[PDB]
Design a binder for this molecule. Structure first.
Ligand SMILES: N#CC1CC=C2CC1Oc1ccc3cccc(c3c1)N1CC[C@H](NCCc3cncn3C2)C1=O
Ligand SMILES: CC(C)=CCC/C(C)=C/CC/C(C)=C/COP(=O)(O)OP(=O)(O)O
Ligand SMILES: OC[C@H]1O[C@@](CO)(O[C@H]2O[C@H](CO)[C@@H](O)[C@H](O)[C@H]2O)[C@@H](O)[C@@H]1O
Ligand SMILES: [Zn+2]
Lengths: 407, 313
C-alpha cells in the first residue's frame, strides 16, 4: 500500500542492534544506553503495529523558522556575534535545500551586510568591524555563491582575499585560522574552498598543505585537528574535502579512511557519531556521511572496479530515518538529538545530510532514494562546498573569467 | 574590578573615567540581516570596545574592558587578539594572565579562543609547569574534551614531558576503557617514545589490547587500536593473531571480531598467501554474514569489500 512504508529502524531484528555493554559499565556505555533508550521510544511512536505511515519532512515549519532567523535573532544568539556570516550561510543553504526562493530584497540586504563584514585587509570577519577569520570567510563566500548574482559575486575583494590567505600560510603547509590565531585542519579547508571558488589559487599557495593534511590522518583511519590528535568527522570532512579540491586525495590511506567513516554510523540510531565511542548527532549527517560521496569520487578516479553505481557506502535509509524521526523540532528547525534545542547550525547540516542520503550521482548514473512522502526530496548539495552543485558551477564559471590577482 | 553581574556594576556610558571617549555603534546597515537583539549591557560594552579598537588605545582601561567583552562573548576572537596586544603593550604580568585564563577555561572548556590564548601565554613564558595538572583537572570533568587533549599533546611534545603520560593513560583507561581519546593518547605516547618497531613493545601492546578485548568484547576502541598498531606492517604478518581470534570466534564473536578476520584475509590475499581460493571463500562468506546479519548498517560497505576481493583475487 502506498500509504504504508516499512522502516529499517522498526524491523524486529533491529532490537538486536542495542548496545551490548558486556556487563561492564563506564560513563561511555551509560551515556550511550541513555540515548538508545530515548531513540527507541521515538522509533516506536512512528509504528502502529503493521501500519507504518510515511515519514514527513516538515518543510513549512522549517521555512518559517529560517525566514524569521534571516532578519532577526534573540539575545540567545549573542554567543554567535562573531559568527554572523555563518548564520547567513546556514540559513540560506537550508532555504536553498528546501527549494525556498530568496526574495531579491533579502538577497541584496544579505549582500550589503556581508560587504560590511568584509575586512579591508581581505577576508570576512564575524561582524562589521571585526578582524577577518577563515571560518566566517568560508561562510560568507558560500552565502554569496548561494545568492549567485553578479552583485553578490563582486562583493568579494579577490585581490585582498588572496593576500589575506598568504598572510595566514605557514611554512609546514598549514594555515592559521586568523592572524595570531590557532591552526588545525579547518583552516586548510576554509582556504581551499574560498580560493578555488573565487579562482585565486596560485601554484605556491597550497604548497605543503596536502602533506600536512595527510599527517593529520591517524591510526584510526580518520583525520584529527592536528597531527597526533583523535580522528573526528568534522576534521576528517575538512581534510578530505580540501584534498579533493587540491586533487591530492591519494596522499591519504583511503582504505583506512573508508573503513573508519563507515564505522561511525550507529547501528541502532542510524545517524552518525563524531568519533568512536561518542554520541550520535544530527549534524554529523553531513560531516561524516558527506565523506562517502567524496571517497566514491576519489576511488572512481582511480578506476576502482568494485564501486557501486547506485548507492553511497553507508546506510542511506537508516540515516534518513534518524533525521526524519529524531532530528526535527515540532516548531520548525532541526537538531542534534531528541531533547536538544534547535539551532540554525543543526538545521543546516541535518538537511544537508538528508539531501546526500537521498541522492546518489556518479558519471551519468543517478539513483534517488527518497524515504517518506515524495515532497521530502531536497535539492542536491555539492559534497565539497556544501552549496547547490548549480551554485558551484555558476560561481566557478564566473570567477574563472577573471585573472588570478597579480597572476 | 567589577564583574558584569556585580551589584555595583556600571555601564560604560555612565562611567566618568570613560566620558572622554565616544562609543562607536555597530554599523549593520539600513536593512540588517541576522540582527541580534543585544541586551543593553552587551551592546554597551561592545560600543566601547569598538571605540578603543578603532582608536587603537593601548590602555589599562581598555585592558579591563576586554575582560567584560570576553565574559559577554568568549568566542569573539577580535577581542582576544586585542587583549593579547595590550598584554604586550602594557607589559602585563603573564602569570597573572595565566590565573585568569585558567578560570575562564574552567567555565568554558569547549571554546577555541580560550585554549589558544593559554597556549600563547605558555609560549611567551616558556613555562609548562602548570599545564599537565591543569589539563588533568579539565579532563577530570570531561575525559574527552578535544581541546584539552590537543593542548596536552602540544605541551608534552613542545616541552618533552613524556615521562609520566603512559601512566596517566593507564589510569584513565582503568576509569573508562571505552574512552577513545585515551586510546589515541596511548598511540601518541608510544609512537613518540619507544615506537612500535621494538618487538617487545609491540608484544606488550598486543597482549594489553587483547586482554582489554576479552574483558569488554564489544568495546570498539580496543579493536581499532589493535588494528591500528598492526595495519602498517600488514595484518597477515601475524599468523598467531588469526588463530587466537579464530578460537574466540564462537565464545566471543561480534561484528568487530568478524570484521577483523576479513581484514586479515584481505591482507593475506594481497600477499600471495597459500590456499588463495580457500581464503577468498572464507572472506566472501564473512562479508555476506556481516552484510546480511551481523553488521547490516554497513551492508553497502561489506558488499563493496566482497566485490573488491573478487576483482583482485
Ligand atoms: N569549529 C568547530 C566545531 C567544534 C565542535 C563541534 C562542531 C564544530 O562545528 C562548527 C562549525 C561552524 C561554527 C560556526 C560558528 C560557531 C561554532 C561552529 C562550529 N561553534 C564553536 C563551538 C560551538 N559549539 C559546537 C557544539 C557542537 C554541536 N554539534 C557538534 N558540535 C561539536 C559552536 O557552535
Ligand atoms: C569549516 C568548519 C568550521 C568545519 C568544522 C567541522 C567540525 C564539525 C569540527 C569538530 C571539531 C571538534 C573539536 C569536535 C568536538 O566537539 P564535541 O566534543 O562537542 O563533539 P562530539 O562529542 O560529537 O565529538
Ligand atoms: O590510517 C592509517 C594510515 O594513516 C597514515 C597517514 O596517511 O599514518 C597515520 O597512522 C599511522 C598508524 O597507522 C601513524 O604512525 C602515522 O603517524 C599517522 O599519520 C598512513 O601511513 C597509514 O597507513
Ligand atoms: Zn551537532
Amino acid at each position: 500500500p502506498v500509504w504504508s512504508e516499512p522502516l529499517y529502524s522498526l524491523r524486529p531484528e533491529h532490537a538486536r542492534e542495542r548496545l551490548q555493554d558486556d556487563s561492564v559499565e563506564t560513563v561511555t556505555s551509560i551515556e550511550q544506553a541513555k540515548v538508545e533508550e530515548k531513540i527507541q521510544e521515538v522509533f516506536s511512536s512512528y509504528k502502529f503495529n503493521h501500519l507504518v505511515p510515511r515519514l514527513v519532512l516538515q518543510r513549512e515549519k522549517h521555512f518559517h523558522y529560517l525566514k524569521r532567523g534571516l532578519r532577526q535573532l534573540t539575545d540567545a544568539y549573542e554567543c554567535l556575534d562573531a559568527s554572523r556570516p555563518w548564520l547567513c550561510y546556514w540559513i540560506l543553504h537550508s532555504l536553498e535545500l528546501l527549494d525556498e526562493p530568496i526574495p531579491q530584497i533579502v538577497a541584496t540586504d544579505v549582500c550589503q551586510f556581508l560587504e560590511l563584514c568584509q575586512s579591508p585587509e581581505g577576508g570576512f570577519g564575524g561582524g562589521p568591524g571585526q578582524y577577518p577569520h577563515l571560518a566566517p570567510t568560508y561562510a560568507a563566500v558560500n552565502a554569496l555563491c548561494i545568492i549567485g548574482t553578479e552583485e553578490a559575486y563582486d562583493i568579494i575583494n579577490r585581490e585582498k582575499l588572496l593576500q589575506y590567505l598568504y598572510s595566514l600560510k605557514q611554512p609546514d603547509g598549514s594555515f592559521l585560522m586568523h592572524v595570531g590565531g590557532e591552526v588545525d585542519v579547518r583552516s586548510a579547508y576554509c582556504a581551499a574552498s574560498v580560493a578555488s571558488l573565487t579562482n585565486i589559487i596560485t601554484p605556491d599557495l597550497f604548497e605543503g598543505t596536502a602533506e600536512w593534511i595527510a599527517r593529520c590522518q591517524n591510526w584510526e583511519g580518520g583525520i584529527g585537528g592536528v597531527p597526533g590528535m583523535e580522528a573526528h568527522g568534522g576534521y576528517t570532512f575538512c581534510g578530505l574535502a580540501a584534498l579533493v579540491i587540491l586533487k591530492r586525495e591519494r596522499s591519504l590511506n583511503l582504505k583506512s579512511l573508508l573503513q573508519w567513516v563507515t564505522s561511525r554510523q550507529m547501528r541502532f540510531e542510524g545517524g552518525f557519531q563524531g568519533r568512536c565511542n561518542k554520541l550520535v548527532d544530527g549534524c554529523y549527517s553531513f560531516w561524516q556521511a558527506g565523506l562517502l560521496p567524496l571517497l566514491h569520487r576519489a576511488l572512481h578516479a582511480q578506476g576502482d572496479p568494485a564501486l557501486s553505481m547506485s548507492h553511497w557506502m553507508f546506510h542511506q535509509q537508516a540515516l534518513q530515518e534518524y533525521i526524519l524521526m529524531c532530528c526535527q523540532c515540532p516548531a520548525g528547525g532541526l537538531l542534534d538529538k531528541p531533547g536538544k534545542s534547535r539551532d540554525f547550525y543543526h538545521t543546516c547540516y541535518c538537511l544537508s545530510g538528508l539531501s546526500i542520503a537521498q541522492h546518489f550521482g556518479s558519471g551519468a548514473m543517478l539513483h534517488d532514494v527518497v524515504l517518506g512522502v515524495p515532497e521530502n526530496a531536497l535539492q542536491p548539495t555539492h559534497p565539497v562546498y556544501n552549496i547547490g552543485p548549480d551554485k558551484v558551477i555558476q560561481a566557478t564559471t564566473y570567477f574563472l573569467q577573471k585573472p588570478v590577482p597579480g597572476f | 574590578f567589577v564583574s558584569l553581574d556585580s551589584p555595583s556594576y556600571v555601564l560604560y556610558r555612565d562611567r566618568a573615567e570613560w566620558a572622554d571617549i565616544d562609543p562607536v555603534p555597530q554599523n549593520d546597515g539600513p536593512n540588517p540581516v541576522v540582527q541580534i537583539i543585544y541586551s543593553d549591557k552587551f551592546r554597551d560594552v561592545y560600543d566601547y570596545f569598538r571605540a578603543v579598537l578603532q582608536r587603537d588605545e593601548r590602555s589599562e582601561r581598555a585592558f579591563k574592558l576586554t575582560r567584560d567583552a570576553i565574559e559577554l562573548n568568549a568566542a569573539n576572537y577580535t577581542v582576544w587578539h586585542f587583549r593579547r596586544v595590550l598584554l604586550k603593550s602594557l607589559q602585563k604580568d603573564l602569570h597573572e594572565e595565566m590565573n585568569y585564563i585558567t578560570a575562564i577555561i574552567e567555565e568554558q572548556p569547549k571554546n577555541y579562543q580560550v585554549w589558544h590564548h593559554r597556549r600563547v601565554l605558555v609560549e611567551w613564558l616558556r613555562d609548562p609547569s602548570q599545564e599537565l595538572e591543569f589539563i588533568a583537572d579539565i579532563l577530570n570533568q570531561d575525559a574527552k574534551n578535544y581541546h584539552a587533549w590537543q593542548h596536552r599533546q602540544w605541551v608534552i611534545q613542545e616541552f618533552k614531558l613524556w615521562d609520566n603520560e603512559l601512566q596517566y593513560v593507564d589510569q584513565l583507561l582503568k576509569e573508562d576503557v571505552r574512552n577513545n581519546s585515551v586510546w589515541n593518547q596511548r598511540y601518541f605516547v608510544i609512537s613518540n617514545t619507544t615506537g612500535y618497531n621494538d618487538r617487545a613493545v609491540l608484544e606488550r601492546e598486543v597482549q594489553y589490547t587483547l586482554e582489554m578485548i576479552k574483558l569488554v568484547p564489544h568495546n570498539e576502541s580496543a579493536w581499532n587500536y589493535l588494528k591500528g598498531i598492526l595495519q602498517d606492517r600488514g595484518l597477515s604478518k601475524y599468523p598467531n593473531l588469526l588463530n587466537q581470534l579464530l578460537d574466540l570466534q564462537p565464545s566471543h564473536s561480534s561484528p568487530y571480531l568478524i570484521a577483523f578476520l576479513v581484514d586479515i584475509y584481505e591482507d593475506m590475499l594481497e600477499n600471495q598467501c597459500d590456499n588463495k581460493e580457500d581464503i577468498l571463500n572464507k572472506a566472501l562468506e564473512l562479508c555476506e554474514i556481516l552484510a546480511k546479519e551481523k553488521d547490516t548498517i554497513r551492508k553497502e560497505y561489506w558488499r563493496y569489500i566482497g566485490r573488491s576481493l573478487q576483482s583482485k583475487h
